């Protein structure tokens, strides 16, 4: 909770308003309304794992976090999955009207990549706007795919899982990897499958709570038991490779 | 006409589909259906004018026009200008719909944040970065300041043009400067003046086709009074620097 402190009070501090604009309120807003902050704590678990910097941990925490935070404020907008609310709040568009929101958006991705670039690594800049070109693929194949189940392969929806969320994961553990001078090729791999299954995950958690999904092509036994290989996969890997925390973080989060 | 081959060659090289989605071919679109390119062609003439490496050049023009082609897909949007068209053509939406169109910009902006990457130049990274926030912010203000232009200051206006069209203007001078090794305080300087200048132009070539702009606020005669002011100091300090290519593009840029 410590860590999450941290990550709060460094994302409000970038999105503070500073020339009196709506759409300033709205990417503040957008922030504040709140989350999980998986993604960043992770950054940091990863990071303090294997002895890196604070300083140029919390910028690239805070860098994947705005991200994140900016693709759900366009993913929820009316022409594309028209969400009135998220985490009970009204979405970013119902608040400010869907031309502000649109643009608060923008501003998060582009505060995004400054964060990056404050920590003046060439590799690490190329890796996130690599990580974030794959990322809009992967929503686009999200927003392609809808009502075409039959049409889509199982190898295509798990390739747009890939993409769409297992990118974003691959590098909250590739970048302190890098930040430290460490081949990242083992753990990238090791963000995706975590990925695949966090949105597995998340399928069966909106199926409870009574487009193409990983649940819908494999059925909900078939697709659970592929989240849990991942998952186990994951964890068997960060625990032999004495990524203690990390470990920790992610067995405690499964439960959850 | 041939540096506009050049760019028309690279930029078309890196928005052909590769994935087979609707919204690579929307970014395709956006792309093809063209410009005048005065952005890319301005990069490729200052750095020529100081002895700057064609191919990292020519990634920056290119970055710079994808964002700039980005920015106009967000704008051409229903919620913000709602543009039907755009140079005679369906605007990107009108042809593939709100919800693909802006996934498209998205695409855009990340296509040209990983073509500046490649360059490999930390500085570089930083400031186009820090360009991008800047050309939003403008953006916003320009959206925000709507219908406001008793209570908008003349000085807020021009705040609103060195932010939506300057910034970017700053960096296509900046950005070879960077890669030369050279000071860029100077230059980024005229790059503003020069975007503010082009963008009243703009203005007034759409008062004579018969918003807060500084046409209104100043009224055409101390509104193209400024611009040219702006123009000329642009040019001759062009000229002073022995800047021969950029001074002769500009100059009849001038005419059109």
């Known amino acids: 909770s410590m860590k999450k402190e941290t990550i709060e009070r460094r994302i409000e501090e970038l999105v503070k308003p500073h020339f009196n604009l709506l759409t300033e309120s709205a990417m503040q807003y957008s922030v504040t309304a709140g989350g999980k902050r998986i993604r960043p704590l992770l950054v940091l678990t990863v990071g303090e794992d294997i002895g890196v910097e604070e300083e140029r941990l919390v910028d690239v925490a ?7 935070t900016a693709s759900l404020v366009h993913d929820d907008l009316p022409p594309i999955d028209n969400a009135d609310f998220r985490r009970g709040k009204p979405s970013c568009h119902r608040a400010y009207g869907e031309g502000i929101a649109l643009l608060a958006g923008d501003g998060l991705f582009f505060l995004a990549f400054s964060q990056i670039a404050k920590v ?3 590799k690490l800049f190329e890796e996130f706007s690599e990580t974030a070109y794959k990322l809009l693929l992967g929503e686009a194949m999200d927003v392609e795919f809808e009502r075409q189940e ?6 295509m929806v798990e390739k747009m899982y890939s993409f769409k969320t ?9 970048a302190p990897f890098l930040l430290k001078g ?5 753990v990238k791999k090791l963000g ?3 990925g695949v299954a966090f949105q597995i995950y998340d399928d069966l958690k909106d199926v409870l709570g009574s487009k193409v999904t990983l649940v819908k092509k494999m059925g909900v036994q078939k697709a659970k038991q592929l989240a849990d290989k991942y998952y186990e996969e994951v964890l068997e890997a960060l625990e032999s ?6 470990f920790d973080f992610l067995r405690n989060l499964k439960k959850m």
């Open 62 to 68: 805070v860098a994947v976090e705005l991200f994140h």
């Open 120 to 122: 003046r690594e060439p």
């Open 150 to 155: 039959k049409e889509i392969s199982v190898e």
């Open 166 to 174: 297992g990118a974003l994961f691959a590098f909250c553990f590739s």
């Open 182 to 186: 460490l081949d990242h090729t083992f």
């Open 192 to 194: 995706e499958k975590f």
């Open 241 to 246: 490779e004495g990524l203690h925390r990390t």
